[PDB]
Amino acid sequence: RPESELIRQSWRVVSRSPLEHGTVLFARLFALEPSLLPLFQYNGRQFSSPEDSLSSPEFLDHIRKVMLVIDAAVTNVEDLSSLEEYLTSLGRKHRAVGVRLSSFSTVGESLLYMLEKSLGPDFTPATRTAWSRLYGAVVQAMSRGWDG
Numbered sequence: 809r810p811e812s813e814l815i816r817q818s819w820r821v822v823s824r825s826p827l828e829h830g831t832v833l834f835a836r837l838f839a840l841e842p843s844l845l846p847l848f849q850y851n852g853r854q855f856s857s858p859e860d861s862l863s864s865p866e867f868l869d870h871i872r873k874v875m876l877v878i879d880a881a882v883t884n885v886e887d888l889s890s891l892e893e894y895l896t897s898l899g900r901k902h903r904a905v906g907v908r909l910s911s912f913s914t915v916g917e918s919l920l921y922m923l924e925k926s927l928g929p930d931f932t933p934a935t936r937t938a939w940s941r942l943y944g945a946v947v948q949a950m951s952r953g954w955d956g
């Protein structure tokens with residue numbers, strides 16, 4: 809496809825340094841939606857502030873995990889049916905550790921921001937569209953995980 813290459817080449821710059829880009833993604837996330845902050849419960853503490861999240865090794869390990877799932881989605885961009893079953897468990901595994909569904913849209917907007925910031929003009933409207941389609945299929949898979 810056109811779309812599949814737009815994804816792959818955009819993701820290339822990001823995969824150089826997933827934690828750095830993932831940190832943008834999560835900092836944006838809490839900027840948009842500070843109420844997600846308590847859902848990362850790591851040794852019975854809530855982060856008080858967004859920046860607290862940035863000092864948690866477990867939060868950063870979570871950033872790595874997020875980026876690796878998106879990396880898988882990119883590897884399978886031509887056919888995402890192969891990751892559907894995982895993504896559904898991930899969604900289930902989300903709700904099971906407490907996380908809400910609505911907020912995955914906010915993750916998607918955060919991902920787009922991170923790409924846009926990282927790629928600047930190379931992030932064309934068609935890349936945005938393609939990413940929005942890629943990520944949208946991730947979330948649709950994942951949403952099955954909230955059985956229904």
Ligand code: HEM
Nearest residue numbers: 844847848849866870873874877878901905907911912915
């Ligand atoms: C609002 C968004 C999110 C919140 C609040 C959140 C929170 C959590 C929490 C609390 C866990 C359990 C503790 C941990 O393993 O770090 C978890 C696990 C996980 N999250 Fe997220 N998460 C979110 C989004 C995402 C997204 C978008 C992805 C991937 C695209 C992702 C990938 C994972 C993975 C891979 C795990 C480990 C799951 C397993 O046990 O197999 N998360 N997340």
